[model samples]
Target: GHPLSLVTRPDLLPPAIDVRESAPGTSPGYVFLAPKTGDVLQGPGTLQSGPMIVDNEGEPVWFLPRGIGALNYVTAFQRQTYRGEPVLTWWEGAPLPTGVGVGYWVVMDQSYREIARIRAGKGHAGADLHDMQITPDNTALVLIAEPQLHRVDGHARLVMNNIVQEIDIASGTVLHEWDSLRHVDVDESYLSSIPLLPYDYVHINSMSVDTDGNLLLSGRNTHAVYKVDRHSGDIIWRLGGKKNDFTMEKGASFAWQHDVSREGDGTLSVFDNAAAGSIETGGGAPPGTVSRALFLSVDTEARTARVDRSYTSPDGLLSTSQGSMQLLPNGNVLVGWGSHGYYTEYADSGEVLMNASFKDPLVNSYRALRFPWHGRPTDSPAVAGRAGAHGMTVHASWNGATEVASWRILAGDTPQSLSGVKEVPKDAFETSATVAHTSSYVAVQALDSTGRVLGTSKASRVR
Candidate 1:
């Protein structure tokens, strides 16, 4: 069972750093940082702030400001070929109410220029589209659309009406399409009926197209991920349902906004958010429960699935409500803590290497990613020698402030010694230089455009 209280406190979060920007000729998995707007609940007042491209070292390299007056809640930013050109695609929209707001399918260049906003029907009358991918032919894009429809009870149903549309960028036409509603019966869902319901219908959060033209999707409300044949639109197999054929150990059940990705070796991985229960199917717990990440291995040839590994935050520190898991190049897993406001990197053996969190009034994070890159911008300044010798780097960011430009870095044994330090530019897109020195403590002072230092990071230990 999940815990009732938050596992980690707000005081232990990591500071946001400006990482390197995205440039031409960057390698695959290279960091691309953007300062696009975050969700209304977790970011500045109402505007989304980023879509900035940063490197693996947490340096801001490029910035893409969403001109959309409202917050640009971007859920995923993926790189793929579009009409023979390398471009980036991201889903922009707020979470619930599914698609009442301005949700869109936007494609941009490496330089952050808007290339296309594929027509998503008239007005903003479309569902909240989730994970997207460009087809092998590079002609159209595929995505999961969760539309908000009214059920018999008059309550809103955030339906996982998964629709895969192949859109023509030049003509703004949906050439091909597939709907999940036609393939799966509502009776098969875990949440067909229940009391105290938050919403109706199973929320489908993710969709992936495999090499065989098969589709893999996660229906969060259903507590199951399905693999369907695109050609026949038939349910080839399913994982994590009441009638689940896969093996579960003595005490294990998967639920909520989990992620499923194909590994290089042909196996699959999932960051199972094991706590979100579906009221429709009498699944999940009462409000305020926690969750975990589960990894699964499947044998497609034999139609079998097994629990490969599982990762839950110690004492419930990472009760993620909605998030993703990235299989890093080094075999480590990057776990984004969804509503928990944290992102952590774990070794193959599930050891924590680096962990960071974002904190602000009314803010909750959904996902976090890390990759290597160069020439990113930042708001942190440079500090010379340290009080000790192991070297230290600090990343700090403020959301409510508008007058900040650069930052001041200070290091010393006492707070007095760490005061009045050197100042750096407030680019918020630059990388921090590695200073080789040991310091028991370090601090950062926010500066205004006029070079007036505003605030500093709380003194921290750097051993």
Candidate 2:
């Protein structure tokens, strides 16, 4: 008999705003077109930055100045307490040293002020922090750092190796670290023979923390996501990639930019950017292509994994070289077409909600987010699912969501009730469970704080 899973059609937004390359210096690295408003948040050339809010017609409303030379690769952003007050925390940095890399941390207010800045490091120096999130205490920030070491063989013959790290945002101190080389040998890496150096090997793309303090890291080069015990630094489990022991499901062979978060059903939902691998054999493909987002269900009780649902760009046009998946409150998935230069929304069943790409030809978004503003009508998920069972999961197409804490899952039969559920707290998006009896009308809902349901699965015919 076939394995049990839930599949849903996502609501995709129409191309409300087309992403176009604006003039240089108008927006630096990448830009996103607002869905509600057509305004373009073109990177103003400010380095590591956050999404600039613009009007629907393309006018700048609020902007977060990351810093002048800093590459604000603001992959993750959300509201949290800062010294007992609510504030927005986001990962900020450039592409290392030579516009190729850099990393930093930025704390901002709703008004987008430069409150604090924490430097991760330059290219090939230390681990370049990717994604980040605020702890429950809000005193320190949890982040993912990618460290690279390169060997030059002349001008174009440079090789690279990669690793991931976790840091404390307050003092720029390395709270905990995971060296891919230590646990995962270079020989075991999938790209070992591709002439990729250690600095380029095992690119640790994303990171997340569980309630047990275990760190979950995603390695795009290795094509696997690992759960590391933060206390002992031991790998607890592996998902996807070349080292995985599990069988590859139909559409789950090559997933990238893997982001993990809690869902309403107690299972973990992920944005499996299906760009870097071939469908025939399910392996990594060449660069500069589009991909898809996958939703996975991990049954910790059963100690097994499976793909519950997935979404890809129409005609492979939305393949994000790098991007994130944010679970929204309305059972919609907010997608940032990393490197593809677009941001769109999809319903629980893969229906287009509000598709908008930056019209300014100059803007290319690396990440995108959807959070409720203050005084805005809040819609939190109710009905918490089993721990680790339902929540949010993020992938990098390379390294996944590296800075996630616990994921929360909540859902209901109706859209409004599904969006009205409260958020559950659980670590790691890999936890799964077996229900007493599958319900034919059940759907899986994943969410972030501020009541945003990142993504949801369609109703399934329970076995």
Candidate 3:
């Protein structure tokens, strides 16, 4: 009934949220999101319905409304490259085939306008929500799950086959392709029984390119991480799978994880969702347990792996689905609790520097990530000045613009020779500066943190 929680009916304003004061240290940067509220696991509930960008204080910076076409709501809001130019990219669609999502990947500019939309097209299903990226070659690396009917026990059965493809950003060419069913055995699957319509056995959730240029893919169903050869389309090695290659040391183990990122320090990190819907798994952290951010030190030569570091919950939190882990530039780690509505920043020494939750646990972001960004919107800045009883009350704001340190009001009788009269630090959304001058024309200039002009607003006639 509340305004913010009422997803179906558009409300008065965006939800009021605040950042947590967990130890009071500086947060790394803005946190990116793909928030969803009350999906299948929860109930018929309000759909938070968008990929969002929020400041370190959990204040919203950007968002798109619900069901805005096939580009309905977005996920994986991050900075990427296209033709050597920095751009923003996200997935805008619903998940298809089964557990993984399917949708078109969209690229947008600083002005928050869509420039390119990518899809697998007719023959293939759309990209999945688990991951999307624009590689160095200006191509789209996407995860897709295609369901196929095959003979099972001499009877026809529906099986969702997980596939990853690399397509040219502009040309729509399939640069490379890898199918999980062909490369990995079906017996490695965790599900003993299949649903009547869809058999989601191999749920590949995350992937990253290793230093050697091979693809590291993580399948939630198999509870394993596989390093595949990008050229030959072959499985290089399987970690934490049935056919284990490495020896687990010091009780170091993870399963049903997401964001299997290889750190620069010869280690692998994952958001280990230790539990699997209370279903007994042949291999995993444990049957019933809390989720954790796990870091493993791997000795490829010795074939050994150990848990070098981890962040756990005081009270058990079993995030059954969707989570991510990111290594920050300041020797910090950003952990997004997949199914639960919680995110945290941890210092190198394991101190909880910052903590925040966008909403209740019923609402959760697919993953949260952090990146240093500076967005200079193409549209002109907004300015409004009124001759109030106190003085000229000047207010200014620029939507989708990120690098604004201060605002300087320019007032003059004519637009040609406006003089800067008042300066004020930026408010979260709009900067309001009060000046004594009763000038006829008022304009504003946005400055960066270092006081460099980023953009200038058109002069507004002050009444």
Candidate 4:
């Protein structure tokens, strides 16, 4: 986040994330993050939150705020393909008292314009703030949190059921729906119910499509990942938890995991969040157990699973809530330390290449991901001018513009009579230039690498 900016777009205040690079051979992509204020794992708080994209140097590429007064937060900010075009997607809404969110899914194009807004299917309350995936068929797989009354110990109690709805993007129709309560019983959960809260028996935090077209569902409360048949919505197999179908070898078992997905090499990746807060789930890491990204090799025929490799943070952070493990395209592994506000990049040999985190203690990103993105905001460049000792100081910035290579400052007595005064290479998000040509009106032009004018800011009077 900028301490302050003297440009027209001064409201773009992203969190000040601290990034450090130990090695130079990390992957090539912008980091996607959603720094939210409230703890969705616990209760809600009235604070600002929004989605942000940053470069490897931790400079903001794009930042869209949820406003300080807005009662909502954003999560799962990533770049994905929609309708054969690259689009940005995220989840935005207010967190409910039951430690889940009631929100909708958002899809925006490269110009940062909303292309689609998806909601839960019929009979569902609302979408949860955990995860959403865009399928290869251009459809959306989203999570829905539904609180229903169920018999726990021969008595009717409130239980939160996790549901997966595969919806058609073109039309608001549900093509397929999977309910956890129908396939998995509440007795499989390790989390007990609270006094006046809904029992989160199956906290389905992540979803993905396997190579064979099956759906991989992660249940945090149950400490298991399920492979369900996409067509029949039946459980094909369970990897962990008490009802595990595979024999877990030493170091293969994981508890309180999130972001379970099938890697490219047919292996499985899990962000093993071994600990959680007491208000949500009351489990702490045993003695020396720290949160790590676990990779497992599963033998379907032999019904056995073994740990292939694991990547742990250098600081041994045991994140108590939401985390993610992403296998980058270049074989680098990126780990987001959920509620701990840290993200680390690791090589294949478990070398820490890069690490970063938010400066604010209360800020937390639900997931930190890396993706190749090209953003060009529709908004024009912003310019502000002030009279300095030399002459006039010109400040220019174009938010979300990726092709800006230089800034051309124009100065004149009148807005209509502006002329080029000085040109300076693009610095940070905001660039400044001092020129001897002091004029009443000043404007700026954003130039690309080939010296071609991209966009120009409106002229403003020098104060």
Candidate 5:
């Protein structure tokens, strides 16, 4: 099969697990990615988790191949803060053609328990598994791709409508809803009508709430970023394409872009997937034009837009489908190579901080994001003891406990009564300690950095 960009480079990744492949210069943070292991070379049958969480060292911290229930294909993998605490959030659903989806949003606590489940309350078939976020107001902001039959030029055809809605997390109430098809003309769409397929014009892929309370929406088909009035649902301005609100300066053009994140200083960043999905979706781009992470300076008063920083792949990476670009908190820019199966982090000064590739052309994630998270599992610690001729080897492990610095061993013949026998520094996923003599029972205690017992394990009887 033919691929977009054929630029091949040797893997420069460091020694890592099989899932990680190889990650040479991995930055300091956890990578939250959901591999779009579609049916292809080493597809869904091979990948372990729907949304796998890994560290800089490229080890799987958590993965659930069957997310929520029995469904896989997790999208929008990211770490978010909920109620002043960090929680993992993502969307798991079945995808339809023309970038359509049907599913719900999931929120998981530190203990790995499903904390909340949110879905579309305004439209049919629940919410699209495209984009979702929980705002500071305890409200869920989501973008739904709904199939609606609209009269387009005297013909009743099924056209996909992009609906942006905000639902209250607790009350299941539709707080606010906006229809792009109503505001945007079908003529402005780059994707025209097709027989037996939904005529999707403005495919809304990303949205964000600006500090001024305005909403920012990224339309894939129209190839534009629209600033909508959050209160009235009116389109304030368009950044790109035919109905230009901002005059372009210095080649400030983006086609079929995905993520549109507003910087605090009035500037905006986008994953300029220049292909326009010509090879994949639609709104195609010119030859030699590749995917890039762009930072644009938008001055509404000046009525102009200029390129501030344009980050292109080192290997001339060109993508035909999905990707993301995020401005991390450490002033590092993170760019996920859309449909190409990789992610790169760049420092503020345009230096490559880390480059992690999960797969090649076979699989791709809709978006890959990173956020600081600390998971403390509620389950009890695990212990196993193997009685040897001289000593009893005790193995202890507590999944999701990040504060464990050392382990204290306990041994006794009785089940309830045990004495502290030995101690050892925490090694890896599972720590092993060997007592000088054999014992019938063994237990372990997780100690923090300051030698505090955070939790204890169940006693294991040696055979």
Candidate 6:
């Protein structure tokens, strides 16, 4: 909510975030965050909300703001590999009253170009914001929330059943589809099934590809993680809930969780929200309970689950909805406290290395992750010039370009005859340079560390 003083690129406004704690030897990468204004689609004081990437020190590296007219929320904005090349992906859609999303998945190249867009198949509703797992086989696993009338508990009830789809990204073919209610009975839900409104019995929130190529699905309302066979469309096992197939140890069980996935080290990870209701509906954790990132080792042969490692935020936040646990490459754990607007990076031994949060309490992100991203926007640099009493000041900025090390100011009497006047080191998102040259036109050229010009801005008339 802090005011920014960006003159050249005023449209690239990102919310101010605070980096409360930081240390050396933390994972080396940028933080991926997607901020969303809850339910209030349009308003006067809302900032442009969408996918934003920032450095470990909380400076904006790149930002793609949502349109003011279509102020929908984007979730799970993180880097992924498409066609063996790194790309960014997120779900963009409208948020519903039931805390679910109706939207589509977006895939963008490193040059900030939209490469692909994935929508629901013929019969299902729009894709949900919960998860979009891109497989190594060039396929994607996405979630959809479908409301259909079904006979449950001796009544015709409208149930909000969750659907999982594995589609080939190239041909847009639905490789496989799995419905929650079709395999798991409606009576397995821990939440009450009301008759008036659509009952969200199994609110599926996250999906992952198991080590054996199966699908691991997390159902929030049912408080269970289901392992479904990819080819047979059958649930291989359930981890928690009323019909669990395994025995959960003391700290192994979770409730109202999100972002369940199988880690590289043969362990499963989940963001254990430990709360019941949504933050939009005044949901909070019970008196002494707090949200956590849980890593568990599940033995299928013995049918038992045990906690391997668990981490809670320093302040013990109780996230009522939307969280993530990412296992970093360096054996670090990054936990996003969803609905609380904070993310923490902890060492594998449970030591906090970095902690940060949005300055505005109202902004929340569905997930926060860290990855090495090198953005090179196709757009040119933006420049604004002002002639003051001391000298002429030039404001230079390039929204998504990350390799710019400095700015080389060019000034001349006319736009066609501009010459190099001065060079200034690159500042955060926008940089200001005061040159003694008095000229009518001023521009800036982005330079890398080796004095290579990346892009040049159009000459702006000094006013």
Task: State the C-alpha lDDT per candidate.
Answer: 0.55, 0.47, 0.73, 0.85, 0.74, 0.86
Expressed as tens digits, the lDDT of each residue in 215-326 for candidate 6 is 8999998899999999988999999999989988888889888999889998889899988664222454458899999999989899999999999999879988898989
Of 1 and 5, the candidate ahead on lDDT is 5
Q: What's the candidate order when arranged by decreasing lDDT?
A: 6, 4, 5, 3, 1, 2
Error of 3 at 215 (Å): 1.1
Per-prediction TM-score to the true structure, in the order listed: 0.64, 0.59, 0.84, 0.94, 0.84, 0.94
Model 3 stretches with alpha carbons more than 4 Å out? 1-16, 22-27, 39-49, 61-71, 109-115, 192-194, 278-288, 313-316, 359-361, 384-393, 410-421, 433-442, 459-463
Off by over 4 Å in 2: 1-50, 54-60, 65-85, 90-94, 97-100, 121-129, 137-165, 171-173, 192-199, 277-290, 318-320, 375-463
Q: How accurate is candidate 2 locally (lDDT)?
A: 0.47
Number of the top lDDT candidate: 6
Better of 3 and 4 by TM-score: 4
Error of 5 at 376 (Å): 2.9
lDDT of 1 by residue, 1-463 (tens): 0011111121212224422232232223443322323345444443334454444444334434452324555555555578777676666765454322336767876445678876554333553545556666554545545444545346555454656666667776766666767865554565545444333345566777765778777777677778877666677787777556566554445766566767665657676766543433345465655555666667777656766776666436535356777777777766766666555566778776555443332333345655543221233332223233456555545432335577776677775676444556655433243445555567677677777766555666553
Point out the higher-scoring one by TM-score: 2 or 3.
3
Better lDDT candidate (3, 4): 4
Q: How many steric clashes between backbone atoms does each model show?
A: 61, 122, 4, 2, 5, 0
RMSD of each: 11.5, 19.2, 4.5, 2.4, 6.4, 2.2
Which residue pairs show collisions in model 6?
none
Which is better, 1 or 3, measured by lDDT?
A: 3
